[PDB]
Structure formats: C-alpha cells, structure tokens
Design a protein around this ligand. Sequence first.
Ligand SMILES: OC[C@H]1O[C@H](O)[C@H](O)[C@@H](O)[C@@H]1O
Ligand code: NA
Ligand code: NA
Length: 149
Amino acid sequence: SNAGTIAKPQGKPILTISGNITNTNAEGAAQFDRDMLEALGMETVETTTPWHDGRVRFDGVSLAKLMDIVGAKGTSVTAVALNDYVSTIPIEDFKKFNVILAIKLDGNYMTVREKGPLFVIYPYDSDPELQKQTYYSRSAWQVAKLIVE
Ligand SMILES: OC[C@H]1O[C@H](O)[C@H](O)[C@@H](O)[C@@H]1O
Ligand code: NA
Ligand code: NA
C-alpha cells in the first residue's frame, strides 16, 4: 500500500527505502531526493577509512533517523548499490554507532566515481570495534536502495 505519510520527492529520487516499513510515498516504498535527505538534518562523521587518504569529513543523514522516518518494523536492512553490491546490516548498528548515509565528502557532493551519491559511513576511528571488516562490509558505497526485513 501507499500510506502517503511522506511527501513525494520534487527532484530525482536517489534513495528508495522499501520492505517491512510503515511510512511511504510510493507503493510499499519511501522515495527520497537529495533535498529531502538534507532536510532531515546533516550530521558529521570525521574519520580515516580503508579507502581514503588521511582523516576525511563526511556529512550526511542519520540512518537511525531514516529508519524512524519510514517506521521500520524489521531488525535487518539490505543495502543495494548502483554497482550491484548487496549488504545486510542489522538496524541496531545505526543506534549503537553514529552511522550516517553520507552525502558530502570534505564539503563536496560525492560523484558515482567518488563512491556516491550515498555511502553508509561508520565512525571507524571512534572505537576499535568499528576498525574491522564486519563494519567495512556494512559500509555500502553508491547506495540506491534500503530493503527492510
Ligand atoms: O581507517 C580505518 C581504521 O584503520 C586502522 O585500523 C586504524 O588503526 C584505525 O584508527 C582506523 O579507524
Ligand atoms: Na509492502
Ligand atoms: Na555482513
């Protein structure tokens, strides 16, 4: 069903959240353009990563907030990337850690060649627990879809 409890996007959708959710703006899905994501509030994560040179600044939307916006009912979300990557992420990670869906890198929007437009980012250098392949594997870049189960 389409609850119609989230506004329809005015620009091109860059993220579709679907599955075991409550709040939608399409059949069984919540479509978001970049303006809608920025409007939810931008959070900052500064960290080194396995893929970047030195400490970089990511700005993006809290994934815990996105799960609350769509009324996620499940405990698992599958990220699907533009490049075909599929990554299952326990939703509890988003709360425990400041995980963000990054939109900007060092103050600039990320192109597809820069792992954008959306990139799941954990604050790796904030806790030795996060400096592990478990969380690097959950850090899906070029995210297009989040399927809640
Ligand atoms: O760049 C990701 C991680 O790489 C290494 O494990 C560093 O020791 C750690 O501080 C950092 O968070
Ligand atoms: Na549905
Ligand atoms: Na995994």
